[PDB]
Every structure is written in C-alpha cells, then in structure tokens.
C-alpha cells in the first residue's frame, strides 16, 4: 500500500476530469427579476 | 388486494363457530388411511390463530399418554367436517406459548371458565 512511483502531470489531469461542478437550476421570479432555485421560495421576489 | 379476495371468496367456509385462543375445541378431521372414510376426533386447547383470509391457520394442543401433541390446521380446510367448542376460557393473551411448558395444575389453571 505504498505508491511505487510518483504520478505524472498528464495522469493527474486526466483523473481530475470528472471533478467539476454543475450550473444551478435557476428560474426568474414572476414578480421582480430575481433568480432563485427552481421549486424554492421568493415571494420577496 | 381486493382482487385476491374476490378470487378466493368461493372457497371460504361459513359453517364455522367463533372461537378464541384459549378455548377447547373438538375437531372432526377426515382420515382416508385404508380408504374406508373414517372420522378421527381431536380435542385440545387453541394456542394460535394467526392468518387472515383463506390463509388463516390455528393450532390445537393436547396431552396423550404423557406426550404433548401439536396439530396445526388451515381454517377453511375441506378435511374438517365440523367444529364445536366445548368450553370457553378466560385468557389474557392471544398466543399461549407459555403453557407448552406448564404441566398439570399450572396448565389446567386455563380451565378458568367465562
């Protein structure tokens, strides 16, 4: 259970390809123009 | 599950007395051993009444020659001619597993009559 060798840059970058975030689901508030998460609340919107 | 009830309604029996775990029954089960259709009678104490519907089953316990015997039957079996209740027993429970270890006086305490 000991790393036999260091990890190259290219393999590290390849492994980090699924490690990213998603754009949120946002809708605009009927009254106002604020943006909130869909199915979330904003009467103050 | 109403569908299953309609499916199975025609086999449900109606000539059945009302009995409770703790009562004494005298079942008339049919024996086809040497063909020669014969009635063998069982008499004992109702121990269990689990089930519900066509799957309802009851257990009867007796003592014969010093050995206690359990016989379990389906409620609606056609292998039963008729059931009559000999005695009514007052019991504080629904499953009577405790008296399968009692003997004699301690067990016959159940003979308390309502």
């Amino acid at each position: 259970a000991v790393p036999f060798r260091r990890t190259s840059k290219m393999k590290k970058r390849l492994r980090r390809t699924h490690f990213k975030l998603n754009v949120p689901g946002m809708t605009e508030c009927p009254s106002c123009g604020e943006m909130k998460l869909s199915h979330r609340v904003c009467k103050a919107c | 599950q109403k569908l299953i009830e309609d499916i199975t309604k025609e086999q449900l029996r109606t000539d059945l007395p009302a009995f409770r775990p703790g009562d004494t029954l005298r079942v008339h089960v049919k024996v086809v051993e040497g063909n020669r259709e014969r009635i063998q009678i069982f008499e004992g104490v109702v121990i269990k009444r689990r089930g519900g519907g066509i799957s309802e089953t009851f257990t009867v316990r007796k003592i014969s020659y010093g050995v206690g015997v359990e016989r379990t039957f389906p409620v609606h079996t056609p292998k039963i001619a008729k059931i009559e209740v000999v005695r009514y027993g007052k019991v504080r429970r629904a499953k009577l597993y405790y008296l399968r270890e009692l003997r004699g006086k301690a067990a016959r305490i159940k003979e308390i009559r309502r």
Binding site: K36, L37, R40, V41 | -
Partner: protein, 119 residues
Amino acid sequence: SYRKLGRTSAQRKAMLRDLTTDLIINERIETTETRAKELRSVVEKMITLGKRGDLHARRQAAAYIRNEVANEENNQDALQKLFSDIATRYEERQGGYTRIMKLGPRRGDGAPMAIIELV
C-alpha cells in the same frame, strides 16, 4: 419506511416532540428539509387528535405534547391552544394542514433549509 435522521431511537422521538410543540406554538418554523418532511406527519396526526376534542384524545395528545406556554397574556398551554384555537380553525379541511417551502442551503454546512407552516 421512515428516516432515522442521524439520531438514536430516543433522541429522534425527543426532537420530534420538541419540533411538534414548537410548530404548535409559533405557527411557522424554520428547520432542515428532511426534518420538516418527517415532522409533517406527526404534526398532522396531532391536529387530527385535537379535532376530535374528547377527553381520550386530549390525554393521547398530552402524552406527547411538551409542557410549554403558548402565550403569557391568557396563561394558555400548548395543549389548550391545540384543542381550542387550531381545531376550530381547521374545522372544514380534510387533511393537509401544513405546507413546506424550500429556502436554500445553509452557510455553516450546506444543509437544505425549509419553512414549515400551518395553512
């Protein structure tokens, strides 16, 4: 089935009792999304008990509601409020006395927050 909410069998019961009493008192509560989702059922069952009004239902409710003060002006218990104020308000509804509105993530731990209120 039902959620365990990260507690043991007794802490879960205690937190549910506390939240039910708090919602009865304040008419509107802010808590996590899953706590509200689990609180909805118990609070509606107790509203159902209060809608009956007899002594048996009153004692069944009392065996679960906390001993707290609804408002100090009239020296009113939470149980008294349940059996006098809310049961009269919801005399025509058949179920569905609550509604959950989702707010968004908390800053401390990213937990999803929600408001649960009586309709």
